[PDB]
Amino acid sequence: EEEAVRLYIQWLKEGGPSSGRPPPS
Incomplete structure (x- = not known):
């Protein structure tokens, strides 16, 4: 699950x- 992208992007x-x-990263 994208913790990221809401975090990364x-x-x-x-x-x-x-x-x-x-x-x-």
Whole structure:
């Protein structure tokens, strides 16, 4: 189950403040 993407894409994608944040990976 994707804990992630709400968490991961939460990092970078659409609503994700990237460039200066550690990802799920």
